[PDB]
Amino acid sequence: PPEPTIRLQEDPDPEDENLYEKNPDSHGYDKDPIVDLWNMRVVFFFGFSIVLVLGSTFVAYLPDYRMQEWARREAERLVKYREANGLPLMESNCFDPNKIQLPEDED
Amino acid sequence: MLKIIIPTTMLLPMTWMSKHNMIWINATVHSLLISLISLSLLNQLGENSLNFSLTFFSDSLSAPLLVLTTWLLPLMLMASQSHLSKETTTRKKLYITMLILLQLFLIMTFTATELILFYILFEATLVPTLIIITRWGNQTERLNAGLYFLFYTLAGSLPLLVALVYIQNTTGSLNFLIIHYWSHPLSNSWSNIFMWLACIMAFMVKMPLYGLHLWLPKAHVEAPIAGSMVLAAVLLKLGGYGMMRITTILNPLTNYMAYPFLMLSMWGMIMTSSICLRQTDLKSLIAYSSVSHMALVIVAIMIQTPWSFMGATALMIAHGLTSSMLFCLANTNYERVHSRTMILARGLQTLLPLMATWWLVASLTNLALPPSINLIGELFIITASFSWSNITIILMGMNMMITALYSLYMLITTQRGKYTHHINNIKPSFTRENALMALHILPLLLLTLNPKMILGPLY
Amino acid sequence: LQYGPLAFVLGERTTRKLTETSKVITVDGNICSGKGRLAREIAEKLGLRHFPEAGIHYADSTTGDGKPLDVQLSGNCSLEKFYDDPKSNDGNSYRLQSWLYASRLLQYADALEHLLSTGQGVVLERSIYSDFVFLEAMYRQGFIRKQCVEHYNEVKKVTACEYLPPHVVVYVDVPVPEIQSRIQKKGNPHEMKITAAYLQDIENAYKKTFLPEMSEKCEVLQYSAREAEDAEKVVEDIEYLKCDKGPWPDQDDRTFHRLRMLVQNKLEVLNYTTIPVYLPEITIGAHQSDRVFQKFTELPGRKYSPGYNEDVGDKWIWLK
Amino acid sequence: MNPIIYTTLIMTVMSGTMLVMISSHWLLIWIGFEMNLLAMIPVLMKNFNPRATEAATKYFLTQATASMMLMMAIIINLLYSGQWTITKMFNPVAMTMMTMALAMKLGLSPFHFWVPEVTQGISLQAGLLLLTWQKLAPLSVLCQISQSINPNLMLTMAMLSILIGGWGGLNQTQLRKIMAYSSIAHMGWMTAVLPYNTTMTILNLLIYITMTLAMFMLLIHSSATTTLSLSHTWNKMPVITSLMMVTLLSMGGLPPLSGFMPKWMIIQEMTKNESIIMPTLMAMTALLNLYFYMRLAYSSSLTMFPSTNNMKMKWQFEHTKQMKLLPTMIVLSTLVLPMTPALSSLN
Amino acid sequence: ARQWQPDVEWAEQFGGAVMYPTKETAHWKPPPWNDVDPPK
Amino acid sequence: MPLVYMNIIMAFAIALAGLLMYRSHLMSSLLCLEGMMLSLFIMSTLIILNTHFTLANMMPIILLVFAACEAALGLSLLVMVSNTYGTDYVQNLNLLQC
Amino acid sequence: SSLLDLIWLETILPKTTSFIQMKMSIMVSNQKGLIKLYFLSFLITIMISMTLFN
Amino acid sequence: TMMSGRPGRVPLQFLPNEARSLPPPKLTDPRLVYMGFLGYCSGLIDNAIRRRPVVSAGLHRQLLYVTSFVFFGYYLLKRQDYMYALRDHDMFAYVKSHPEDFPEKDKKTYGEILEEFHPVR
Numbered sequence A: 001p002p003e004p005t006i007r008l009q010e011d012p013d014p015e016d017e018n019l020y021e022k023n024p025d026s027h028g029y030d031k032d033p034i035v036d037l038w039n040m041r042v043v044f045f046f047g048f049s050i051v052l053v054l055g056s057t058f059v060a061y062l063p064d065y066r067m068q069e070w071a072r073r074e075a076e077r078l079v080k081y082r083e084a085n086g087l088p089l090m091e092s093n094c095f096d097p098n099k100i101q102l103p104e105d106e107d
Numbered sequence B: 001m002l003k004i005i006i007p008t009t010m011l012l013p014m015t016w017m018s019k020h021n022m023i024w025i026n027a028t029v030h031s032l033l034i035s036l037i038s039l040s041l042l043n044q045l046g047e048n049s050l051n052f053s054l055t056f057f058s059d060s061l062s063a064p065l066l067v068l069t070t071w072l073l074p075l076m077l078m079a080s081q082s083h084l085s086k087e088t089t090t091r092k093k094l095y096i097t098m099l100i101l102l103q104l105f106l107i108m109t110f111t112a113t114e115l116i117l118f119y120i121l122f123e124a125t126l127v128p129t130l131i132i133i134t135r136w137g138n139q140t141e142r143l144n145a146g147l148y149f150l151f152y153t154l155a156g157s158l159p160l161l162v163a164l165v166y167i168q169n170t171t172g173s174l175n176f177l178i179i180h181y182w183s184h185p186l187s188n189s190w191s192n193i194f195m196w197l198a199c200i201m202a203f204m205v206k207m208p209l210y211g212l213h214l215w216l217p218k219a220h221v222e223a224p225i226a227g228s229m230v231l232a233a234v235l236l237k238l239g240g241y242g243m244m245r246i247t248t249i250l251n252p253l254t255n256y257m258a259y260p261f262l263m264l265s266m267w268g269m270i271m272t273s274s275i276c277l278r279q280t281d282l283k284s285l286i287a288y289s290s291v292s293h294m295a296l297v298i299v300a301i302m303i304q305t306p307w308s309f310m311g312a313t314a315l316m317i318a319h320g321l322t323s324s325m326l327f328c329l330a331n332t333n334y335e336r337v338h339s340r341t342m343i344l345a346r347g348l349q350t351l352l353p354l355m356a357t358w359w360l361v362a363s364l365t366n367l368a369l370p371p372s373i374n375l376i377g378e379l380f381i382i383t384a385s386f387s388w389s390n391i392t393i394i395l396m397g398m399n400m401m402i403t404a405l406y407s408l409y410m411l412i413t414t415q416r417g418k419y420t421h422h423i424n425n426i427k428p429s430f431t432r433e434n435a436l437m438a439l440h441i442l443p444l445l446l447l448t449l450n451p452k453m454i455l456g457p458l459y
Numbered sequence C: 001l002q003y004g005p006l007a008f009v010l011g012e013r014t015t016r017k018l019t020e021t022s023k024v025i026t027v028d029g030n031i032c033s034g035k036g037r038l039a040r041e042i043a044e045k046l047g048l049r050h051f052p053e054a055g056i057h058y059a060d061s062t063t064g065d066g067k068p069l070d071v072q073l074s075g076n077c078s079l080e081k082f083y084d085d086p087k088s089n090d091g092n093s094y095r096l097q098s099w100l101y102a103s104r105l106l107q108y109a110d111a112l113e114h115l116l117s118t119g120q121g122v123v124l125e126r127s128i129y130s131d132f133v134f135l136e137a138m139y140r141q142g143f144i145r146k147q148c149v150e151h152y153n154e155v156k157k158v159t160a161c162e163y164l165p166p167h168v169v170v171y172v173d174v175p176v177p178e179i180q181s182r183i184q185k186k187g188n189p190h191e192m193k194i195t196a197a198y199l200q201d202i203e204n205a206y207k208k209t210f211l212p213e214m215s216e217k218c219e220v221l222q223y224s225a226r227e228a229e230d231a232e233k234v235v236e237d238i239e240y241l242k243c244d245k246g247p248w249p250d251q252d253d254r255t256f257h258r259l260r261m262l263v264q265n266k267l268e269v270l271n272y273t274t275i276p277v278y279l280p281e282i283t284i285g286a287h288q289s290d291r292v293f294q295k296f297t298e299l300p301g302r303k304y305s306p307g308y309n310e311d312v313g314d315k316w317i318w319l320k
Numbered sequence D: 001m002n003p004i005i006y007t008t009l010i011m012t013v014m015s016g017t018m019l020v021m022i023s024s025h026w027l028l029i030w031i032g033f034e035m036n037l038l039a040m041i042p043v044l045m046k047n048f049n050p051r052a053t054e055a056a057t058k059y060f061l062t063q064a065t066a067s068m069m070l071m072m073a074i075i076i077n078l079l080y081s082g083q084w085t086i087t088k089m090f091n092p093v094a095m096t097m098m099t100m101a102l103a104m105k106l107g108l109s110p111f112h113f114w115v116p117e118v119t120q121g122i123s124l125q126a127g128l129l130l131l132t133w134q135k136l137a138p139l140s141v142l143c144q145i146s147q148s149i150n151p152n153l154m155l156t157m158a159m160l161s162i163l164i165g166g167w168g169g170l171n172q173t174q175l176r177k178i179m180a181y182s183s184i185a186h187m188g189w190m191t192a193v194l195p196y197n198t199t200m201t202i203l204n205l206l207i208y209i210t211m212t213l214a215m216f217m218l219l220i221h222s223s224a225t226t227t228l229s230l231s232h233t234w235n236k237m238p239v240i241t242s243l244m245m246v247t248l249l250s251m252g253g254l255p256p257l258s259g260f261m262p263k264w265m266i267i268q269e270m271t272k273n274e275s276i277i278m279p280t281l282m283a284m285t286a287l288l289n290l291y292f293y294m295r296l297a298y299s300s301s302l303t304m305f306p307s308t309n310n311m312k313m314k315w316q317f318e319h320t321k322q323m324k325l326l327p328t329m330i331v332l333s334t335l336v337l338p339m340t341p342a343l344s345s346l347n
Numbered sequence E: 001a002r003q004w005q006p007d008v009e010w011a012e013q014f015g016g017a018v019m020y021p022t023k024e025t026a027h028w029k030p031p032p033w034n035d036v037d038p039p040k
Numbered sequence F: 001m002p003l004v005y006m007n008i009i010m011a012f013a014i015a016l017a018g019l020l021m022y023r024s025h026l027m028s029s030l031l032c033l034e035g036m037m038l039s040l041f042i043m044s045t046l047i048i049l050n051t052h053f054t055l056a057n058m059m060p061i062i063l064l065v066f067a068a069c070e071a072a073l074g075l076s077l078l079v080m081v082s083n084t085y086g087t088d089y090v091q092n093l094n095l096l097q098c
Numbered sequence G: 001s002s003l004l005d006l007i008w009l010e011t012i013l014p015k016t017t018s019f020i021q022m023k024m025s026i027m028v029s030n031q032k033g034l035i036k037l038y039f040l041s042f043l044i045t046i047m048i049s050m051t052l053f054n
Numbered sequence H: 001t002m003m004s005g006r007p008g009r010v011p012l013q014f015l016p017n018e019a020r021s022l023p024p025p026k027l028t029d030p031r032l033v034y035m036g037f038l039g040y041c042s043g044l045i046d047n048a049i050r051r052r053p054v055v056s057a058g059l060h061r062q063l064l065y066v067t068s069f070v071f072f073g074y075y076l077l078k079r080q081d082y083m084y085a086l087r088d089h090d091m092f093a094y095v096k097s098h099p100e101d102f103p104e105k106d107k108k109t110y111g112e113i114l115e116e117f118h119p120v121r
């Protein structure tokens, strides 16, 4: 058996590098300390300061385009009218029966 | 809608002309800005929709998914920064290009007024994910996973295409608006039964359904962290969005045809929750938990009531965020220990306390603790199911119990107990990882303040 | 107008350039013999072009700048290690032999291209033919395995079946003991460690397998140590004999056009030196391959095509 | 051979095809096929070796048999109607003989056996010419007489061709046999839409020719005829492997690539005729083609295979010959899906 | 620590005359590197 | 349709079948092709002469010419194949396999 | 986990498909390159086409 | 729609004279912009394959690719529009000349049509 027991010429598997060794205060972004610090700063400013706060405030104050207040005011005036006029509040038929032509069965 | 699509396209030239050491910073900044821009589609109407043009329209079902899709890209970049550090500049730029292409395809998929355009983009998303899994995955099984993830999908998607073109030959249009307004009942016929199956199975395989869920643990365990994040957060929700869109033309045949899928989902959620109890792999456990949650979403869509649809929307958003966070936590452990086995690295609360707090919050939100939006969706679906049949409460309660059990089991196994003695390479958690967890979790607890934003068009 | 079918169609024919002086010659001999001096004298006297023997960095001399590259980026082998530890565990011996054969093939293609393009003859040391003799010795001394020689034979067949052999084969016959005396008088510490068995195997596989095989398709001039000193008689012998037994008299314009398209395109010359047959001595892992290729690309004038490298000093890039 | 002779032979092949496509007389169409056959053989036998001679002999035998059957059909049709113009067949027996002859010329199943044999025997340039240019004439003749063809027989042969291509490509490690089986499957896709729309046949032919040209030129550039030989290409020219992978994705019909355009349209067309089952089987069978394309993509660019030491020498040299139309072919075979309605140009 | 890449035993799966070797096709030999056979 | 035409067509079918068995002798394959063209010539000539279609008296000649040219090419190919093996046996062409 | 997810759900859809396609490929591609058999098959399909579609 | 035999069709004419009655595509047509983009991608791939600086190797070559793609795309768009115009013209003429095959259906409102109601329960 003259074989070297080696299937091929391969690089050895390297050991994983620690970012805290060559740079304490490493922030875990990049091995260049300046790029690391500025990547931290941009992530924090555009993620927490801009999107997370201003976007939440923007969503909180979105105008009532779903028409909830409008619907409640319409219902309030409608109830006020129907209570006064003795009408039976909501009706069972959603559409006026006089504008529906039913088919005669005559069976 | 182009005010979102064009900046996403401009992300590519900006990425490729960036400096060798400026790709991550620029990509993250501009992705966050695009998310902020997309956040203004949440202003929806109680009327029809936001019909921008003949090609793209917005809905209160589409808008939360679009916002989540935009928000996911910066987090994916932050998560991918670490394990791609020793990589060449060209290949890092190619990875970022794959991520940007996937975002663009998803954004166009979710608006997509046409069913054929929706199908084309829905299948276009399949390519970048496949490349990401089979190229930047660590294990030898990634290739196999990719094969599964591909063919399963196409096995369901080719019949759909046929059905789609068939429909346009009879209806004359595949526009969602005309399809909805001109819908006519579907007769109880063999031809209509097979048309129903062709329309459903494509979205059913992607949820995934309990019977057809085998590709998912493979794909998630084999994919890199960003691939897992996008698979669990957005790609699983394409099936739910498609089913909600397409079930409008399948009535009243859904009443009869839904029974096998309802039984498969209600039993397979119990099955996968119990599977999570005996799992030696974190990623596999999180994948099976995702299968259970999507089984509940399938039940919601098949029941097809207003409360079902609201709960399905809420649960899809909540699960996307929670599962992405869980995968990120498991990946932070893996990048230290290189094992991905749950029993190996133990007692990490003593060594990494803030990350233990993140683990606790993620487990609590996966457990559906009120008033989280996870429980809002869960409870709405459960109430709709109870109205559908009062006996479903048994299976729902069992699922809740088993879910609490495996969530706290995963927390206790990894964080509590005694540290493993021979593991001495556990470094303090980085600012990048803590910020990643915070950017996952704060949006959930903010969304619980305004739930109507994620309750869909039937709110 | 780079040579191609259009040039052949318009005017370019290589038969008119031949003036009975082309007559490619290849000199041989043992490891430590005066074959190089005799070859240089032949080249000077006949007015031909001399090709110094191909080494580890012969390809480096014809590409980019002529400066040799690093050993890890060019060859990944060394003769000094072969001398020091001929039975090395990393397979340096057969890696060296295969890289040297590829260099010989490249140099033979270059010589054929020069002869077919200019008509001037060339003189060479050890060619792709008689390169195997070292291989044979390495097999008998136990330095390489039988799979190594089988892979060498496959590559040699599929590569050397495409070229015209030299008209004249010149051999300098020097016995082993006087070669060894020359070796010790040389002074090279690594050269000192050659055994007499290795040189004997080289010579024996040399005059017991290479002389008759070239006798049937080439014209061989055997010379001893004393009678190789005088190049005048060698030149006279070369001029007197006429070659009419090999493949050369049967060549014509279209065969020459085929061969001239062959000898250009060094990538298509070197095509079969990397056939996917996996010997541990020569196969390289994916990770090391990626790292070494990336290191090679980062060389000063190697990222782009020769005229498109700004760092070396190429200008007007945006208009080329 | 002499470059002038090679140019003359190529122009004779092209003139035979053009004579087939411009003539209205059956005898002139037969003469064009004969001229094309006659000038095709030396092109296949350009690189002289026993494999190429065997391939040329097989090709000549099959094509001469097809020509004899074509003349037989012409004579029967003349017997039952004194007509020489290419239009109607005028006889059920003459139409069957004609369809068989044209299927043998195209390589449709069950007459597919010669395609892998000849493609493996000949070089890459000869295979490029064989699999691209040699389909124009039989398909043009088929497009002219499509209203005569029995849809049952044509659809049977098309489905057989798709099935055979899919199953036969799964077992291949040689790239030329993979190309041959891909060609067989694409011929099956083309001929399944002739009874309904010849415009879709022509569109499929154009897309297939573009993809095949790009694929063959990439294979010639990275001069590999074997899967393992192609596995070494990344260590010299990774961009070529990336372009090859995207081209293979396009060839598999994956959207949003160009190769999705024909099948989609074809399926679409076949649904207008209340044909549902056959397009479904066609797509499910094309999944096999996609599978072996994915296997090649795994072997080529998505993973990095072991290399050899001598490859370093190849790092120092550049291609002497470059292909002018390769970038255009790659872009056209990859990114023309947005331009689909341009098919109304009746290409 | 290192992404897996194919080794020799993985690459040798794709070096046969055909995929999926069988008893009948076991004796089949891959074609010569140059498409030329010995004239015998 | 007379019986003579059917006899000629059946001769054509027999020649085609003979070309299809391939017992051996690619030489016999060329013979079968030549028998096929002979039947084609005969039947085309009969049809054209019967109907007094004066101009198509051209095409049998043409057909003849072209077919013979083909035969020449085929013969050449045969020789080269034999030049490799020393015989024209059909089973010798087994180097390339599907 | 083992009986259903790792075995039977795997056996039914993906494993059966792989086995069927593998056998079909091995059957179809395995031709010894003998044109005798090819042209015999050609004659059989010619007669079947004549006797089946008219 | 096989228009190959449509009467009064000049055999090898790319654009007939009557096609001049149609509005030409605008130079800023999105399809023309996409054809120019395809030419740009071809230039980039040409630079990449030849191992040249991809973005800034040959500006004349990339300009020529873009220009040729735009030229052919303009003429192709014209022919496409003309063919669709012919299809619509023929369809409308056929409907006009065959009134018995395309009848005017009676106008019915939903208040007088009975559709079956299927409760969701």
Ligand SMILES: CCCCCCCCCCCCCCCCCC(=O)OC[C@H](COP(=O)([O-])OCC(O)COP(=O)([O-])OC[C@@H](COC(=O)CCCCCCCCCCCCCCCCC)OC(=O)CCCCCCCCCCCCCCCCC)OC(=O)CCCCCCCCCCCCCCCCC
Pocket (backbone or CB within 6 Å): B009, B013, B016, B017, B090, B091, B094, B097, B101, B104, B127, B128, B131, B135, D238, D239, D242, D243, D245, D246, D256, D301, D302, D330, D334, D335, H041, H042, H044, H045, H048, H052, H053, H054, H055
């Ligand atoms: C949805 C539609 C919208 C999006 C459109 C997307 C498509 C558009 C582009 C299409 C293709 C054109 C370019 C491709 C040529 C490739 C060149 C290259 O290699 O990159 C190097 C090159 C720089 O590197 P270098 O130093 O020159 O030389 C390095 C060597 O090239 C080689 O470097 P190396 O040797 O050091 O590294 C080797 C590497 C080299 O290999 C490669 O680079 C692969 C090249 C991509 C393949 C192209 C296929 C054909 C098109 C397919 C499109 C598919 C889309 C459909 C969805 C499916 C997704 C796959 O290969 C590998 O590492 C093997 C492993 C790769 C993993 C698996 C392969 C996946 C590739 C899929 C990529 C798909 C998107 C590519 C985007 C462009 C990438 C540059 O990158 C560039 O700079 C070119 C990017 C474009 C420049 C944009 C300039 C415009 C900016 C200013 C104007 C602003 C615009 C707005 C105006 C108004 C503002 C005021």
Ligand SMILES: CCCCCCCCCCCCCCCCC[C@@H](O)O[C@H](CO[C@H](O)CCCCCCCCCCCCCCC)COP(=O)(O)OCC[N+](C)(C)C
Pocket (backbone or CB within 6 Å): A051, A052, A055, A056, A057, A059, A060, A061, A062, B035, B039, B064, B067, B068, B071, B317, B443, B446, B447, B449, B450, B454
């Ligand atoms: C360390 C301990 C904390 C220290 C600090 C102490 C103080 C704690 C107090 C904060 C928590 C206590 C809860 C009290 C809530 C007060 C704010 C609340 O009332 O506002 C809500 C408003 O909150 C927002 O609606 C919800 C937040 C928006 C969420 C968007 C996420 C950010 C975008 C980032 C992308 C994420 C992608 C997710 C996919 C969907 C509801 O407002 P609403 O009653 O209605 O009407 C607003 C006023 N109107 C009437 C004029 C309209």
Ligand SMILES: CCCCCCCCCCCCCCCCC[C@@H](O)O[C@H](CO[C@H](O)CCCCCCCCCCCCCCC)COP(=O)(O)OCC[N+](C)(C)C
Pocket (backbone or CB within 6 Å): B188, B189, B190, B193, B209, B210, B211, B212, B257, B260, B261
């Ligand atoms: C594997 C992992 C999960 C994958 C997804 C699984 C979900 C797919 C299940 C398909 C849904 C049911 C299919 C058809 C439902 C219709 C009801 C019918 O089947 O039942 C009776 C039908 O009777 C019999 O069932 C006839 C069909 C029997 C043949 C089917 C094979 C039975 C088992 C095969 C299961 C294999 C499924 C997977 C195939 C690959 C009803 O009696 P009848 O009143 O008369 O018919 C009314 C319907 N009409 C009016 C249209 C005619």
Ligand SMILES: CCCCCCCCCCCCCCCCC[C@@H](O)O[C@H](CO[C@H](O)CCCCCCCCCCCCCCC)COP(=O)(O)OCC[N+](C)(C)C
Pocket (backbone or CB within 6 Å): D202, D203, D206, D207, D210, D332, D336, D339, D340, D341, D342, D343, D345, D346, D347, H004, H010, H011, H012, H013, H014, H072, H076
């Ligand atoms: C596959 C991608 C496209 C590649 C196409 C090649 C590109 C280079 C071609 C350069 C221009 C060629 C045009 C030739 C000039 C005049 C042609 C004219 O004389 O002929 C007309 C014919 O014009 C051509 O047929 C139209 C060619 C246009 C082809 C492009 C359509 C491809 C489909 C859309 C995919 C996107 C491709 C766009 C990017 C290139 C009239 O033909 P006619 O005698 O009356 O009928 C015979 C043909 N029939 C029987 C089918 C009806």
Ligand SMILES: Nc1ncnc2c1ncn2[C@@H]1O[C@H](COP(=O)(O)OP(=O)(O)O)[C@@H](O)[C@H]1O
Pocket (backbone or CB within 6 Å): C030, C031, C032, C033, C034, C035, C036, C079, C097, C100, C131, C134, C135, C191
């Ligand atoms: N094919 C080969 N294998 C191993 N070593 C070789 C080979 N070719 C040349 N060499 C080495 O190159 C060196 C110089 O060659 P040599 O002819 O012996 O000296 P000189 O240049 O004086 O003629 C020698 O040490 C020789 O061994």
